[PDB]
From a paper:
The resolution of the structure, estimated at 4.4 Å, allows unequivocal assignment of all four unique polypeptide chains within the structure, with an overall atomic model able to be built that accounts for 75% of the complete amino acid sequence. [name] is assembled from five symmetrically-arranged protomers, each comprising a single copy of YenA1, YenA2, Chi2 and Chi1. Each protomer contributes a pair of extended α-helices that form a funnel-shaped longitudinal pore at the core of the complex that widens into a β-sandwich domain (the TcB-binding domain) at one end and is enclosed at the opposite end by a ring of five neuraminidase-like domains (again, one is contributed by each protomer). This structure—the pore-forming apparatus—is entirely encoded by the YenA2 chain. A predominantly α-helical shell incorporating regions of both YenA1 and YenA2 forms the next layer, encapsulating the longitudinal pore. The Chi2 proteins form an equatorial ring around the lower half of the α-helical shell, while five, leg-like protrusions emerge from the base of the complex. Chi2 is incorporated into the overall structure such that its substrate cleft is solvent exposed and opens approximately downwards.
[name] toxins are secreted endotoxins produced by bacterial pathogens of insects and animals. [name] is the pore-forming and membrane-binding module of YenTc. It has an unusual architecture amongst [name] toxins, in that it is encoded by four genes, two of which represent an apparently split tcA-like gene (yenA1 and yenA2) and two of which encode functional endochitinases (chi1 and chi2).
Numbering used by the authors:
A (entry chain D): 701 to 815
B (entry chain A): 156 to 304, 584 to 655, 701 to 815
C (entry chain A): 1049 to 1164
D (entry chain N): 2795 to 2829
E (entry chain B): 2001 to 2098
Amino acid sequence: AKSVKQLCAGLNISAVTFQFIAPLVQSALGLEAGTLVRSFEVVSSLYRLVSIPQTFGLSTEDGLILMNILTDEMGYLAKQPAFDDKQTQDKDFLSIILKMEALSAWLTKNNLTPA
Amino acid sequence: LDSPASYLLDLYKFIQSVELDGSNQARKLETRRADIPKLSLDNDALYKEVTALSIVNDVLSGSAREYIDQSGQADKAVNQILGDTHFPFTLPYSLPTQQINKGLGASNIELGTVIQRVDPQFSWNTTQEKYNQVLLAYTQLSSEQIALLNFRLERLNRFIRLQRWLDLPSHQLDLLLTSVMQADADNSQQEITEPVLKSLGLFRHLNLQYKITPEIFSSWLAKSVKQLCAGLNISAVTFQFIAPLVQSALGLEAGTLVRSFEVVSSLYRLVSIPQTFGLSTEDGLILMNILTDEMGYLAKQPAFDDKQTQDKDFLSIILKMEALSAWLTKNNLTPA
Amino acid sequence: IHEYLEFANIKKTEAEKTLVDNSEKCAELLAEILAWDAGEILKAASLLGLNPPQATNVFEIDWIRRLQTLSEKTMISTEYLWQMGDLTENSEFSLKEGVGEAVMAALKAQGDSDNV
Amino acid sequence: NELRGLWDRIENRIYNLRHNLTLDGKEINMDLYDS
Amino acid sequence: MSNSIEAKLQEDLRDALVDYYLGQIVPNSKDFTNLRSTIKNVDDLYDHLLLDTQVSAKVITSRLSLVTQSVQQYINRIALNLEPGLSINQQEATDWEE
């Protein structure tokens, strides 16, 4: 089975986080085993979700907090890069990384935590 | 103009016209060793062509793996058949899924197979089958292949030739096996079976933790000058406990002058085993009394055929001594 | 610790066992006192008679001390540490072939660097 | 005796060339430190 | 990573070599088996396959060097000994000078 590749994705961040990845593949169609097709619309969204929070030193559980707090949803992680939704000013992705930086500065200035 | 290609083609178009024919191998071999003037990609790749030894592996193995396909013997099996043969001294079970389970599991933080002693039970005062998991886990160095233990006789000597799973010289296995095979009362060649093999895990354990030697392990498994000179290892003032030891045979404080092997190997057990844990003889006697209500197979025989009927077996006792030595190092108590 | 143990002991036969002790929040406080994961501790439901289980008032905590320290020696799950038990008894081979590869991948995820 | 010294010398020198990175010294890896 | 290298060696040091040697030569082929007596050691595998087996675990180099080395060794080897049964004319036997 594809379970070796499903586990080997855990190289960047530990595969115990993939309890959050079955909620991600709902932007397409998939299941914890059934995601074996690894389609570019899904794996580029894994690439967004694994890359962008680590620039600010966040864990996946802290990045999911910022998206929930700022946007009431996944903040264009798991979804598409907003590029034609930005053409209609709908919560655009190019603003989200600025908000992540602005909060990372304020939450470095003060001894609080995302949790 | 000149290039790595003008150097190569000045060889290639030269070797093509070395035409002598018939039954001779030379072109037959060279074409069997197949590659061509346009092997792959293009000649400008050269800077990225920098590669390790890994380049060789598919040139050997990639033709070799076709044997089951060519002979028609198998097809759905992706590779693993090369782990399933013997007679050309083929070295089976060699697939990395066996070896990494020893080496890689040690290489990080030095845990090994000893993890089976940790869970899920509340204390090591527990039933015999648990120790039989852990001691076999300590033996491993290999896999379930250990179930294998003129040609009709040499195929029995192959059980010593197949020491290859262990970094042991040819003098070690006869020294290791003869004492336990003498302690076992059975007569026929079936004495090689797993009820003996369990003992090598205890050797491996005491070697890795405390650096014992196969000689000392296989050894422990008026005359007044000699009666005193035994006091070299630990002071002879302890021999108030040795007149109680010789009651496993027949003897007296002077009358033990015969120094028989059933007695002096029990002195060898009693002087060696507690000192691995830094115990004095008076502390070792406490552990045996507390754990077993008796001498815990010190002073008596090494339990080897009493272990065949699960009677307080000696191979569990050294594990209990270690488990208490850890707990009594963790806490500032003393044996006394 | 007292308020947790007193809650774990409430009326298993007449009320709480068939209501799964409200596992979604009673097993949470057992994680919270450790500042640890409320997730993988639910693997304890693989033993002790379809209870949470939690009313065995020390041994589960005593084991979880060693699971928490093992979980800091290595990044392996308690779910995989269970397979390392199941493989003992001359068991089915594909589970060993998979567990060896899974432990290898868990080391690559740390490498010669440190990572996670 | 010269044949036996000669063939063992070339066997040792092939082993060194087959490692390469020694030159019977230690060219590639040196002076590295940690902690 | 530095310890996974041990397994990427071991599969070619042993597995790929012994299963090739027994299986291909003795039962399987009409490839090597037409020449059954010619191979008995790794020195024969080296001479016959033109490849540096069992050695050089740390070395790095271009693929062109390995391709070159095989022909470079062969055009030496045919002039080094007259097995297989080919021969070299006195001009060609002069010009290995180049």
